Design a binder for this molecule. Structure first.
Ligand SMILES: *[C@@H](O)c1nc(NC(=O)Nc2cc(O[C@H](C)c3c(Cl)cncc3Cl)c(C#N)cn2)c(OC)cc1Br
Length: 289
């Protein structure tokens, strides 16, 4: 509740709109986010507390806000724009990504005799590689800021109107010591399927456990938004991970990209690439195509 003049934004310059998801996130119009253009409208996302409002919920949002302030700006993350902390409910104002999360972006754009482009879907291989590259660059930035994501997944990458990838929800209290591994979200997601083995079995989280998750995200990309470990119940996932099993190479995926996935899933975190190495490896592919 103390005033931070660097980040404080007058709440009466916000017009809240339709909710985006559930703290909870609401789309809003902001006037004068740029103090040089005080009447200029922009669209932003506003994170706020739900109606439940427990003291732990508030602490978690305040903690997220403080991570937001120190992370700095990067093109491939959702950036803090401002906060409302005085004379009203706590708002954390961040960039809005017009096309939604990357999983929904891909699933809505899967390939399909009217006109000359009947076989042509919206998604091409170089653009998919660019999505992976941009996520790696954002993750590399986050890692250099000493930010571990802990649930990196296509659902947590957002897509701007210009198809820029932005990592979202990176500075969050994740309830690491009480994960319901069998928990399925309302959209059917089993988040345990993105956890590195050292995170799942030992509750150990490093930038290399994020590299594991990036490998799963790579698989999501090149299945155009498929769900990982298809048809493997959580009980069976435990055992196959204990046996060293990995996902198969997805169809229409070049061996360069499945190779990168398998590196990302090496048992020993030291045998996985760094994000810096993933950026370079992906840059080489992007340039070649
Ligand atoms: C604003 O440009 C805008 N955004 C969206 N969709 C959208 O998802 N915007 C969005 C959402 C954000 O977080 C939410 C909670 C979210 C969702 Cl909805 C789904 N998956 C992950 C997450 Cl984290 C954030 C953030 N932080 C930023 N932007 C529109 O959809 C129609 C429309 C508009 Br104008």
């Amino acid at each position: 509740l103390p005033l931070d003049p660097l980040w404080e934004f007058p709440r009466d310059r916000l017009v809240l709109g339709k909710p985006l998801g559930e703290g909870q996130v609401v789309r809003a119009e902001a006037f004068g986010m740029d103090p040089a253009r005080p009447d200029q409208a922009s669209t932003v996302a506003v994170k706020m507390l739900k109606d439940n409002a427990s003291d732990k919920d508030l602490a978690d949002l305040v903690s997220e806000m403080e991570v937001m302030k120190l992370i700095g700006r990067h093109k491939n993350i959702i950036n803090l724009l401002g906060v409302c902390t005085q004379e009203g409910p706590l708002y954390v104002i961040v960039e809005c990504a017009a096309k939604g999360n990357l999983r929904e972006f891909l699933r809505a754009r899967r390939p399909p005799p009217d006109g000359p482009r009947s076989s042509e879907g919206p998604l091409s291989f170089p653009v998919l590689v660019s999505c992976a590259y941009q996520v790696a660059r954002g993750m590399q930035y986050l890692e250099s800021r000493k930010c571990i994501h802990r649930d990196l997944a296509a659902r947590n990458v957002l897509v701007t109107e210009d198809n820029v990838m932005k990592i979202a929800d990176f500075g969050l209290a994740r309830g690491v010591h009480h994960i319901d591994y069998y928990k399925k979200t309302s959209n059917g997601r089993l988040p345990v399927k993105w956890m590195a083995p050292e995170a799942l079995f030992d509750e150990v989280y490093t930038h290399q456990s994020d590299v594991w998750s990036f490998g799963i995200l790579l698989w999501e990309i090149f299945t155009l938004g498929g769900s990982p470990y298809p048809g493997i119940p959580v009980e069976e996932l435990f055992s196959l991970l204990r046996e060293g099993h990995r996902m198969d190479r997805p169809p229409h995926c070049p061996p360069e990209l499945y190779g990168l996935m398998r590196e990302c899933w090496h048992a020993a975190p030291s045998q996985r690439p760094t994000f810096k190495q993933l950026v370079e490896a992906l840059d080489k592919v992007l340039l070649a195509v």
